[PDB]
């Protein structure tokens, strides 16, 4: 399986802060890279566990975070989507 461990679904953040994203991959097949998305846009990828990306200086809005493990055989494994919201100020 592939899981986003941070942030958690529904978390709120403040504008201009980095959103640090962490993902865990459990597989028998070697992982070539974990690709990190916001909606359909590729943020970055990581070839080395623990797998992470960051949205640096996050602008305001709704972000739908997903991780996709690409195994060495080509097979893609999706995480569920982790939606977060970035606001001007979080009370
Ligand atoms: Na890493
Ligand atoms: Na397979």
Q: Go through the domains of the chain in sequence order and give each one's CATH number.
A: 1-91 (2.60.40.10)
Q: What is the DSSP string of 17-86?
A: S-EEEEEEE--SSPEEEEEEEETTEEEEEESSSSEEEEETTPPSEEEEEEEEEEETTS-EEEPPPEEEEE
CB within 5 A of ion ligand 1: which residues? 46, 48
Q: Is 50 annotated as a binding residue?
A: yes
Distance 91 CA to ligand 2 centre (A): 46
Q: How far apart are CA 90 and CA 44, in angstroms?
A: 26
Task: Identify which of 81, 61, 78 has the alpha carbon closest to the alpha carbon of residue 7.
Answer: 81
Q: What is the resolution of this structure in A?
A: 1.8
Instruction: Answer whether 3's CB lies under 8 Å from 22's CB.
Output: no
Method: X-ray
Length of the chain: 91
Q: Which residues contact 64 (CB under 8 A, 6 or more apart)?
A: 38, 39, 81, 82, 83
Is 88 annotated as contributing to ligand binding? no
The contacts of residue 28 (CB under 8 Å, 6+ apart) are none
Residues contacting 32, CB < 8 A, separation 6+: 47, 70, 71, 72
């Amino acid at each position: 399986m592939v899981t986003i461990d941070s942030p958690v679904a529904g978390e709120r953040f403040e504008a201009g802060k980095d959103i640090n994203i962490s993902a865990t991959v459990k597989s028998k097949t070697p992982v070539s890279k974990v690709e990190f998305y916001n909606g359909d846009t590729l943020i970055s990828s990581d070839t080395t566990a623990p797998y992470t990306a960051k949205i640096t200086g996050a602008a305001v809005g709704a972000y739908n975070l997903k991780a996709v493990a690409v195994l060495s055989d080509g097979r893609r494994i999706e995480s569920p989507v982790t939606p977060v919201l970035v606001k001007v100020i979080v009370l």
